[PDB]
Amino acid sequence: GSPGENLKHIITLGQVIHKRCEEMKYCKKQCRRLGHRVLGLIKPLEMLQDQGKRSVPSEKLTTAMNRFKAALEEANGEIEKFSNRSNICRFLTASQDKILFKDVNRKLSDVWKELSLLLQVEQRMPVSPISQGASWAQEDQQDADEDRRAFQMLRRD
Numbered sequence: 184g185s186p187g188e189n190l191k192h193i194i195t196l197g198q199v200i201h202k203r204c205e206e207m208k209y210c211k212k213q214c215r216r217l218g219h220r221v222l223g224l225i226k227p228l229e230m231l232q233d234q235g236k237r238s239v240p241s242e243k244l245t246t247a248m249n250r251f252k253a254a255l256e257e258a259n260g261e262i263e264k265f266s267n268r269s270n271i272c273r274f275l276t277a278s279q280d281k282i283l284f285k286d287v288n289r290k291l292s293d294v295w296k297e298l299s300l301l302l303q304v305e306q307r308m309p310v311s312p313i314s315q316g317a318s319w320a321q322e323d324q325q326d327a328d329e330d331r332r333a334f335q336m337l338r339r340d
Protein backbone atom coordinates (compact mmCIF):
# COMPACT_ATOMS: atom_id res chain seq x y z
CA GLY A 184 0.00 0.00 0.00
CA SER A 185 2.14 2.85 1.31
CA PRO A 186 1.18 6.55 1.09
CA GLY A 187 1.00 8.67 -2.05
CA GLU A 188 4.68 9.57 -1.88
CA ASN A 189 5.42 7.64 -5.07
CA LEU A 190 3.23 10.13 -6.94
CA LYS A 191 5.43 13.04 -5.84
CA HIS A 192 8.27 11.21 -7.60
CA ILE A 193 6.96 12.19 -11.04
CA ILE A 194 6.38 15.72 -9.77
CA THR A 195 9.89 16.24 -8.40
CA LEU A 196 11.89 14.03 -10.77
CA GLY A 197 9.73 15.45 -13.55
CA GLN A 198 10.58 19.11 -12.99
CA VAL A 199 14.08 18.20 -11.81
CA ILE A 200 14.89 17.67 -15.49
CA HIS A 201 14.46 21.35 -16.32
CA LYS A 202 16.13 22.35 -13.05
CA ARG A 203 19.35 21.04 -14.59
CA CYS A 204 19.40 23.64 -17.36
CA GLU A 205 19.24 26.21 -14.56
CA GLU A 206 22.76 25.19 -13.55
CA MET A 207 23.96 24.09 -16.99
CA LYS A 208 25.47 26.51 -19.51
CA TYR A 209 26.58 24.72 -22.68
CA CYS A 210 23.55 22.43 -22.79
CA LYS A 211 21.35 25.22 -21.43
CA LYS A 212 20.29 25.72 -25.05
CA GLN A 213 19.08 22.16 -25.62
CA CYS A 214 18.06 21.40 -22.04
CA ARG A 215 15.90 24.53 -22.25
CA ARG A 216 13.49 22.90 -24.70
CA LEU A 217 14.10 19.44 -23.25
CA GLY A 218 12.74 20.33 -19.82
CA HIS A 219 10.04 22.60 -21.22
CA ARG A 220 8.74 19.72 -23.35
CA VAL A 221 9.24 17.14 -20.60
CA LEU A 222 7.39 19.31 -18.09
CA GLY A 223 4.33 19.08 -20.32
CA LEU A 224 3.89 15.50 -19.12
CA ILE A 225 4.30 16.15 -15.39
CA LYS A 226 2.38 19.42 -15.67
CA PRO A 227 -1.01 17.64 -15.87
CA LEU A 228 0.28 15.27 -13.19
CA GLU A 229 0.57 18.02 -10.58
CA MET A 230 -3.17 18.71 -10.68
CA LEU A 231 -3.87 15.05 -9.93
CA GLN A 232 -0.97 14.61 -7.51
CA ASP A 233 -3.21 16.34 -4.96
CA GLN A 234 -6.45 14.50 -5.70
CA GLY A 235 -4.53 11.31 -5.00
CA LYS A 236 -6.03 9.95 -1.79
CA ARG A 237 -6.66 6.21 -1.68
CA SER A 238 -3.92 3.68 -2.45
CA VAL A 239 -4.34 2.92 -6.16
CA PRO A 240 -7.32 2.48 -8.52
CA SER A 241 -5.67 0.12 -11.00
CA GLU A 242 -2.10 -1.17 -10.86
CA LYS A 243 -2.38 -1.52 -14.63
CA LEU A 244 -1.90 2.23 -15.07
CA THR A 245 0.54 2.54 -12.16
CA THR A 246 2.83 0.14 -14.02
CA ALA A 247 3.16 2.77 -16.74
CA MET A 248 4.62 5.26 -14.27
CA ASN A 249 7.06 2.69 -12.88
CA ARG A 250 8.94 2.60 -16.18
CA PHE A 251 8.15 6.18 -17.19
CA LYS A 252 9.80 7.41 -13.99
CA ALA A 253 13.10 5.99 -15.23
CA ALA A 254 12.52 7.47 -18.69
CA LEU A 255 13.06 11.02 -17.44
CA GLU A 256 15.41 9.86 -14.68
CA GLU A 257 17.98 9.25 -17.42
CA ALA A 258 17.49 12.75 -18.82
CA ASN A 259 18.60 14.53 -15.65
CA GLY A 260 21.36 11.98 -15.20
CA GLU A 261 22.67 12.50 -18.73
CA ILE A 262 22.71 16.29 -18.34
CA GLU A 263 25.05 15.94 -15.36
CA LYS A 264 27.86 14.25 -17.29
CA PHE A 265 27.06 16.34 -20.36
CA SER A 266 28.25 19.32 -18.31
CA ASN A 267 31.77 18.15 -19.12
CA ARG A 268 33.29 20.56 -21.64
CA SER A 269 35.03 17.63 -23.34
CA ASN A 270 31.80 15.63 -23.49
CA ILE A 271 30.05 18.21 -25.67
CA CYS A 272 33.25 19.10 -27.52
CA ARG A 273 33.94 15.55 -28.71
CA PHE A 274 30.22 15.17 -29.44
CA LEU A 275 29.91 18.27 -31.63
CA THR A 276 33.39 17.96 -33.15
CA ALA A 277 32.55 14.35 -34.00
CA SER A 278 29.72 15.58 -36.23
CA GLN A 279 27.76 12.34 -35.87
CA ASP A 280 24.45 13.60 -34.46
CA LYS A 281 22.54 16.86 -34.01
CA ILE A 282 20.55 16.15 -30.85
CA LEU A 283 21.89 15.47 -27.35
CA PHE A 284 18.93 14.01 -25.47
CA LYS A 285 17.10 12.47 -28.42
CA ASP A 286 17.39 8.96 -26.97
CA VAL A 287 15.83 9.85 -23.61
CA ASN A 288 13.27 11.96 -25.46
CA ARG A 289 12.26 9.25 -27.94
CA LYS A 290 11.57 6.85 -25.07
CA LEU A 291 10.04 9.52 -22.84
CA SER A 292 7.41 10.09 -25.52
CA ASP A 293 7.01 6.39 -26.31
CA VAL A 294 6.39 5.43 -22.68
CA TRP A 295 4.02 8.38 -22.26
CA LYS A 296 1.98 7.32 -25.29
CA GLU A 297 0.66 4.20 -23.54
CA LEU A 298 1.07 5.58 -20.02
CA SER A 299 -1.09 8.66 -20.57
CA LEU A 300 -3.56 6.29 -22.24
CA LEU A 301 -3.99 4.39 -18.97
CA LEU A 302 -4.24 7.61 -16.96
CA GLN A 303 -6.89 9.07 -19.27
CA VAL A 304 -8.92 5.85 -19.40
CA GLU A 305 -8.69 5.34 -15.64
CA GLN A 306 -9.80 8.92 -14.96
CA ARG A 307 -10.25 12.29 -16.65
CA MET A 308 -6.61 13.33 -17.03
CA PRO A 309 -5.20 15.72 -19.66
CA VAL A 310 -2.20 14.29 -21.51
CA SER A 311 0.48 15.92 -23.66
CA PRO A 312 -1.11 17.56 -26.73
CA ILE A 313 1.87 16.85 -28.98
CA SER A 314 1.80 13.73 -31.15
CA GLN A 315 4.55 12.23 -28.99
CA GLY A 316 6.85 10.56 -31.50
CA ALA A 317 8.14 12.31 -34.61
CA SER A 318 7.10 15.81 -33.56
CA TRP A 319 9.81 15.62 -30.90
CA ALA A 320 12.61 15.06 -33.40
CA GLN A 321 11.06 17.65 -35.71
CA GLU A 322 11.55 20.46 -33.20
CA ASP A 323 14.63 18.90 -31.59
CA GLN A 324 16.38 18.81 -34.97
CA GLN A 325 15.20 22.26 -36.04
CA ASP A 326 16.25 23.78 -32.71
CA ALA A 327 19.44 21.72 -32.56
CA ASP A 328 20.66 23.83 -35.48
CA GLU A 329 21.04 26.73 -33.06
CA ASP A 330 23.62 24.66 -31.19
CA ARG A 331 25.96 25.27 -34.13
CA ARG A 332 26.37 29.02 -33.71
CA ALA A 333 25.31 28.91 -30.06
CA PHE A 334 28.28 26.68 -29.26
CA GLN A 335 30.82 28.51 -31.42
CA MET A 336 29.67 31.71 -29.73
CA LEU A 337 30.28 30.32 -26.24
CA ARG A 338 33.93 29.96 -27.25
CA ARG A 339 34.93 33.56 -27.97
CA ASP A 340 37.88 33.93 -30.34
Ligand SMILES: CO[C@@H](c1ccc(-c2ccccc2)cc1)c1nc2ccc(C(=O)O)cc2[nH]1
Pocket residue numbers: 184185189190231238239242244245246248249302305306308
Ligand atom coordinates in the same frame (compact mmCIF):
# COMPACT_ATOMS: atom_id res chain seq x y z
C1 LIG B 1 3.33 4.37 -10.10
O1 LIG B 1 3.79 4.98 -8.89
C2 LIG B 1 2.74 5.38 -8.01
C3 LIG B 1 1.64 6.02 -8.81
C4 LIG B 1 1.69 7.37 -9.11
C5 LIG B 1 0.68 7.96 -9.84
C6 LIG B 1 -0.40 7.20 -10.28
C7 LIG B 1 -1.49 7.82 -11.06
C8 LIG B 1 -2.74 7.22 -11.13
C9 LIG B 1 -3.75 7.81 -11.86
C10 LIG B 1 -3.52 9.00 -12.54
C11 LIG B 1 -2.27 9.60 -12.48
C12 LIG B 1 -1.26 9.02 -11.75
C13 LIG B 1 -0.45 5.84 -9.97
C14 LIG B 1 0.57 5.26 -9.24
C15 LIG B 1 2.20 4.18 -7.28
N1 LIG B 1 2.46 2.94 -7.59
C16 LIG B 1 1.82 2.11 -6.73
C17 LIG B 1 1.75 0.72 -6.61
C18 LIG B 1 1.01 0.16 -5.62
C19 LIG B 1 0.30 0.96 -4.71
C20 LIG B 1 -0.50 0.34 -3.64
O2 LIG B 1 -1.14 1.03 -2.88
O3 LIG B 1 -0.52 -1.00 -3.51
C21 LIG B 1 0.36 2.35 -4.82
C22 LIG B 1 1.12 2.93 -5.82
N2 LIG B 1 1.38 4.23 -6.20
